[PDB]
Design an enzyme around this catalytic site. Structure first.
Site, short mmCIF file in Angstrom:
data_model
loop_
_atom_site.label_atom_id
_atom_site.label_comp_id
_atom_site.label_asym_id
_atom_site.label_seq_id
_atom_site.Cartn_x
_atom_site.Cartn_y
_atom_site.Cartn_z
N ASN A 94 -0.29 -5.80 17.95
CA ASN A 94 -1.06 -6.74 17.16
C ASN A 94 -2.59 -6.61 17.40
OD1 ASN A 94 -2.27 -9.76 17.15
ND2 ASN A 94 -0.92 -9.42 15.46
N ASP A 115 -2.40 -15.34 10.47
CA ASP A 115 -3.68 -15.58 11.11
C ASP A 115 -4.76 -14.54 10.77
OD1 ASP A 115 -3.01 -13.37 12.63
OD2 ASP A 115 -3.06 -14.38 14.52
N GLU A 152 11.33 -3.47 14.81
CA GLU A 152 9.90 -3.72 14.53
C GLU A 152 9.40 -2.88 13.34
OE1 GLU A 152 7.96 -5.98 15.62
OE2 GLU A 152 8.94 -6.90 17.35
N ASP A 207 -0.21 -6.06 12.52
CA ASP A 207 0.61 -5.30 13.46
C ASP A 207 0.70 -3.80 13.04
OD1 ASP A 207 1.13 -7.80 14.71
OD2 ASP A 207 3.10 -7.91 13.82
N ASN A 221 -0.32 -10.47 9.49
CA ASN A 221 0.09 -11.83 9.92
C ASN A 221 -0.68 -12.95 9.23
OD1 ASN A 221 0.15 -10.09 12.95
ND2 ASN A 221 1.95 -10.66 11.80
N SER A 277 -4.54 -11.29 11.55
CA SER A 277 -4.37 -10.12 12.37
C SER A 277 -3.35 -9.19 11.68
CB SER A 277 -3.92 -10.49 13.79
OG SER A 277 -2.65 -11.12 13.72
#
Ligand SMILES: [Pt+4]
Ligand SMILES: [Pt+4]
Ligand SMILES: [Pt+4]
Ligand SMILES: [Pt+4]
Ligand SMILES: [Pt+4]
Length: 129
Positions: free
Chosen positions: A59, A48, A35, A52, A46, A50
């Site tokens: 998220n 959308d 990750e 991380d 991301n 958002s």
């Protein structure tokens, strides 16, 4: 902070992640490796809108507040910036909520694709725990 593999294994174990909801330590170390490459300061945006955050790339759509994800839910009740700290406490406590949510560690796409069903014990091999 960029953790060493065994250093992170030890911190995660101390924070109660070894066998948390049935997931051995090696699973958690593997997820962190793919990750964030063990960097607490990792961020990734991301499609959308958002973002991380941190060692386990939690998220902002559901889990934390970053002030820029409209309709975010802040389920861990924490600014997302708290997830970037060299102290992993906030990330660990939030991850415990996430993995309890019904989908287990499948919530982490790199864990599903890169750790699940592999010999994850290799990630803690040689460590003093
Ligand atoms: Pt530093
Ligand atoms: Pt220890
Ligand atoms: Pt600690
Ligand atoms: Pt320590
Ligand atoms: Pt928000």
């Amino acid at each position: 902070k960029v953790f060493g593999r065994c250093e992170l294994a030890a911190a995660m174990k101390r924070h109660g992640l070894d066998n948390y909801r049935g997931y051995s330590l090696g699973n958690w170390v593997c997820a962190a490796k793919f990750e964030s490459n063990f960097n607490t300061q990792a961020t990734n945006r991301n499609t959308d809108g958002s973002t991380d955050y941190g060692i386990l790339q939690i998220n902002s759509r559901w889990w934390c507040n970053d002030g820029r994800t409209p309709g975010s839910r802040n389920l861990c009740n924490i600014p997302c910036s708290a997830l970037l700290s060299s102290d992993i406490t906030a990330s660990v406590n939030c991850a415990k909520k996430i993995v309890s949510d019904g989908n287990g560690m499948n919530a982490w796409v790199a864990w599903r694709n890169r750790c699940k069903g592999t010999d994850v014990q290799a990630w803690i091999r040689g460590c003093r725990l």
